[PDB]
């Protein structure tokens, strides 16, 4: 079940990136964005992920502010987490 803030599907934000909570259920091949072949993106492995903020599958995401991703979505603004 995801947290009371997570992303959603409803939200503005999440619809114009294309986010899904799972991406499997995700667009990422049709995206291509560059760093890592489309297959292996989530946001795990993506740059905007904040491993210091929710808890368990659920981090935050600077892009969505006050708000929880689940590890293993994604959104097109997918970039390789570099640092
Ligand atoms: S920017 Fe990165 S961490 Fe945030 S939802 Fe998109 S893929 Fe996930």
């Given at each position: 079940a995801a947290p009371a803030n997570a992303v959603?599907?409803?939200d503005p934000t999440a619809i114009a990136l294309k986010y899904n909570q799972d991406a499997?259920?995700?667009?990422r091949v049709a995206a291509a964005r560059p760093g890592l072949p489309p297959e292996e993106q989530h946001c795990a492995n993506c740059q905007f992920m904040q491993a210091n903020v929710g808890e368990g599958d659920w981090k935050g995401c600077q892009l969505f502010?006050?708000?929880?991703?689940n590890?293993?979505?994604w959104?097109?603004?997918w970039t390789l987490?570099?640092?």
């Open positions: 959603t599907a409803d499997t259920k995700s667009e502010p006050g708000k929880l991703i590890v293993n979505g959104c097109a603004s987490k570099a640092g």
